[PDB]
Enzyme design. Structure first.
Site, PDB file in Angstrom:
ATOM      1  N   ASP A   1      22.623  13.203 172.481  1.00 30.98           N
ATOM      2  CA  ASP A   1      21.438  12.547 173.045  1.00 30.98           C
ATOM      3  C   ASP A   1      21.894  11.887 174.227  1.00 30.98           C
ATOM      4  O   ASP A   1      22.574  10.968 174.255  1.00 30.98           O
ATOM      5  CB  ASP A   1      20.896  11.476 171.968  1.00 30.98           C
ATOM      6  CG  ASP A   1      19.676  10.868 172.567  1.00 30.98           C
ATOM      7  OD1 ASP A   1      18.964  11.019 173.359  1.00 30.98           O
ATOM      8  OD2 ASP A   1      19.291   9.797 171.942  1.00 30.98           O
TER       9      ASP A   1
ATOM     10  N   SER B   1      20.608   7.826 174.662  1.00 30.91           N
ATOM     11  CA  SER B   1      21.310   6.770 173.883  1.00 30.91           C
ATOM     12  C   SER B   1      22.779   6.782 173.813  1.00 30.91           C
ATOM     13  O   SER B   1      23.332   7.977 174.385  1.00 30.91           O
ATOM     14  CB  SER B   1      20.431   6.891 172.598  1.00 30.91           C
ATOM     15  OG  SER B   1      21.232   7.760 171.693  1.00 30.91           O
TER      16      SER B   1
ATOM     17  N   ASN C   1      24.971   5.207 170.868  1.00 25.33           N
ATOM     18  CA  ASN C   1      25.576   5.059 169.625  1.00 25.33           C
ATOM     19  C   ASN C   1      25.582   6.472 168.744  1.00 25.33           C
ATOM     20  O   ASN C   1      24.870   7.234 169.075  1.00 25.33           O
ATOM     21  CB  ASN C   1      24.439   4.239 168.834  1.00 25.33           C
ATOM     22  CG  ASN C   1      24.654   3.017 169.145  1.00 25.33           C
ATOM     23  OD1 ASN C   1      23.773   2.320 170.141  1.00 25.33           O
ATOM     24  ND2 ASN C   1      25.435   1.992 168.788  1.00 25.33           N
TER      25      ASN C   1
ATOM     26  N   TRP D   1      25.768   7.372 164.939  1.00 28.44           N
ATOM     27  CA  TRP D   1      25.561   7.011 163.445  1.00 28.44           C
ATOM     28  C   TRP D   1      25.095   7.815 162.725  1.00 28.44           C
ATOM     29  O   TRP D   1      24.671   9.240 163.299  1.00 28.44           O
ATOM     30  CB  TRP D   1      24.327   5.940 163.458  1.00 28.44           C
ATOM     31  CG  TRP D   1      22.920   6.224 163.857  1.00 28.44           C
ATOM     32  CD1 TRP D   1      22.505   6.058 165.014  1.00 28.44           C
ATOM     33  CD2 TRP D   1      22.218   6.732 162.997  1.00 28.44           C
ATOM     34  NE1 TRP D   1      21.142   6.574 164.982  1.00 28.44           N
ATOM     35  CE2 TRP D   1      21.055   7.237 163.728  1.00 28.44           C
ATOM     36  CE3 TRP D   1      22.146   7.249 161.955  1.00 28.44           C
ATOM     37  CZ2 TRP D   1      19.891   7.777 163.382  1.00 28.44           C
ATOM     38  CZ3 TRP D   1      20.908   7.899 161.305  1.00 28.44           C
ATOM     39  CH2 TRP D   1      19.726   7.920 161.977  1.00 28.44           C
TER      40      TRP D   1
ATOM     41  N   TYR E   1      14.526   3.283 168.495  1.00 32.65           N
ATOM     42  CA  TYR E   1      14.163   4.602 169.221  1.00 32.65           C
ATOM     43  C   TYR E   1      12.838   4.539 169.674  1.00 32.65           C
ATOM     44  O   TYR E   1      12.000   3.649 168.990  1.00 32.65           O
ATOM     45  CB  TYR E   1      14.690   5.772 168.739  1.00 32.65           C
ATOM     46  CG  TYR E   1      16.243   5.689 168.533  1.00 32.65           C
ATOM     47  CD1 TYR E   1      16.837   6.136 169.705  1.00 32.65           C
ATOM     48  CD2 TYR E   1      16.743   5.671 167.345  1.00 32.65           C
ATOM     49  CE1 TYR E   1      18.585   6.194 169.277  1.00 32.65           C
ATOM     50  CE2 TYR E   1      18.064   5.714 166.944  1.00 32.65           C
ATOM     51  CZ  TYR E   1      18.951   5.847 168.115  1.00 32.65           C
ATOM     52  OH  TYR E   1      20.364   6.115 167.795  1.00 32.65           O
TER      53      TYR E   1
ATOM     54  N   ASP F   1      17.340  13.371 179.872  1.00 32.24           N
ATOM     55  CA  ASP F   1      17.520  13.109 178.385  1.00 32.24           C
ATOM     56  C   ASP F   1      17.430  14.181 177.581  1.00 32.24           C
ATOM     57  O   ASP F   1      16.221  14.975 177.291  1.00 32.24           O
ATOM     58  CB  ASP F   1      16.538  12.166 178.044  1.00 32.24           C
ATOM     59  CG  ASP F   1      16.427  11.755 176.635  1.00 32.24           C
ATOM     60  OD1 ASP F   1      17.760  11.753 176.108  1.00 32.24           O
ATOM     61  OD2 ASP F   1      15.918  10.617 176.323  1.00 32.24           O
TER      62      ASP F   1
ATOM     63  N   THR G   1      14.889  14.174 174.456  1.00 31.67           N
ATOM     64  CA  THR G   1      13.361  14.286 174.731  1.00 31.67           C
ATOM     65  C   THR G   1      13.016  15.733 174.626  1.00 31.67           C
ATOM     66  O   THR G   1      13.509  16.531 175.456  1.00 31.67           O
ATOM     67  CB  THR G   1      13.138  13.211 175.630  1.00 31.67           C
ATOM     68  OG1 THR G   1      13.164  11.771 175.192  1.00 31.67           O
ATOM     69  CG2 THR G   1      11.519  13.514 175.835  1.00 31.67           C
TER      70      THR G   1
END
Ligand code: 017
Length: 323
Positions: free
Chosen positions: A32, A35, A37, A39, A75, A215, A218
């Site tokens: 992504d 963003s 992070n 996880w 998000y 992005d 998306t």
């Protein structure tokens, strides 16, 4: 140089496999660029979306190291809370040692429940990472695991195999023409300045310039709702009883390109690209206010047409037509 293959899911989501822990526990994650992070779900989470995805078990990893730091992320759609921990992440053939990541404790909502991927691996700047968690690509560079401080993304079309994230490399077999370089306007997202959007020689949106992000996470090409409404009208897209932006498939052969001018260079999208025998618009209105102004999002509709290099050494985005 590391190759991370990506699965092309219905031309809508592109995710790859990673391993976390010793021995490796495997997860699918969206790569992504919107963003920062990393996880995955964990055994500490009882949410429905955790129950129907792979759950990390730190008890079974000899290299896990706990922390006392919490994490929360919201998000555009979807959200999570959890706790940060450290472990070795296998990504693109690279052993990303000492990688901090989120172990989910909640994952509410239906989007994450129905999504095929387990988690998210963000590729954007540290300034937008929740809890200041070191992003994966920052940790790779910090540890000298890639020699060049850049990565490139090829997203396939027509649900084909071959999508890749190339960690530390640029591969000209994925593109033609010259790479053109675009300075990052604001370091956070991979945010750039768009100069105009035109169709058959006239400006249809972004008059006088606007802000956009590149992005991979998306699916569609999104912009402010008012501007997108005009574009939809311009291409003949109508919302139907079911809330879908419907368009006649015959327009694919009728309509002209929509052209994005970025740093003074024209990037066309053919109707073959911006129209998805059920044809819908590849554009969607979505308002993303920031101090920079409202953001447009050049998602997979755009990136499928342009091989993209994300250069952290230079703070620039490189673009060239896909092969
Ligand atoms: C969860 C991701 C796989 C999907 N998202 C794309 C992601 O790039 C968005 C793209 C994005 C960016 C800005 C606004 C809306 C969406 N980034 C985002 O929300 O980043 C978050 C990180 O913490 C916060 O700080 C930055 C924004 C938050 S998403 O926009 O939420 C999304 C969700 C569902 C669909 N079908 C399509 C897109």
């Amino acid at each position: 140089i590391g190759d991370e293959p990506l699965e092309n899911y219905l031309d809508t989501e592109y995710f790859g496999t990673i391993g976390i822990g010793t021995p490796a526990q495997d997860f699918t994650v969206i790569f992504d660029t919107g963003s920062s992070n990393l996880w995955v779900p964990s055994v500490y989470c009882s949410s429905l979306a955790c129950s129907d995805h792979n759950q990390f078990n730190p008890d079974d990893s000899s290299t896990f190291e706990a922390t006392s730091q919490e994490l929360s992320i919201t998000y555009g759609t979807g959200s999570m809370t959890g706790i940060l921990g450290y472990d070795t992440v296998q990504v693109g053939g690279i052993s990303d040692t000492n990688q901090i990541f989120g172990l989910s404790e909640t994952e509410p909502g239906s989007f994450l429940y129905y999504a095929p991927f387990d988690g998210i691996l963000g590729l954007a700047y540290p300034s937008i990472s929740a809890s200041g968690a070191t992003p994966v690509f920052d940790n790779l560079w910090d540890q000298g695991l890639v020699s060049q401080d850049l990565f490139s993304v090829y997203l396939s079309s027509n649900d084909d195999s071959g999508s890749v994230v190339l960690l530390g490399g640029i591969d000209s077999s994925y593109y033609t023409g010259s790479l053109n370089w675009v300075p990052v306007s604001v370091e956070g997202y991979w945010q750039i300045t768009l100069d105009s959007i035109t169709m058959d020689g006239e400006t249809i949106a972004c008059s006088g310039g606007c802000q956009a992000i590149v992005d991979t996470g998306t699916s569609l090409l999104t912009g402010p709702t008012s501007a997108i409404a005009n574009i939809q009208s311009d291409i003949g897209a109508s919302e139907n009883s079911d809330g879908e932006m419907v368009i006649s498939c015959s327009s694919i052969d009728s309509l002209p390109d929509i052209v994005f001018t970025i740093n003074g260079v024209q990037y066309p999208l053919s109707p073959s690209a911006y129209i998805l025998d059920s044809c819908t618009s590849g554009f969607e209105g979505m308002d993303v206010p920031t101090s920079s102004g409202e953001l447009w999002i050049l998602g997979d509709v755009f990136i499928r047409q342009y091989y993209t290099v994300f250069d952290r050494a230079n703070n620039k985005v490189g673009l060239a037509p896909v092969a």
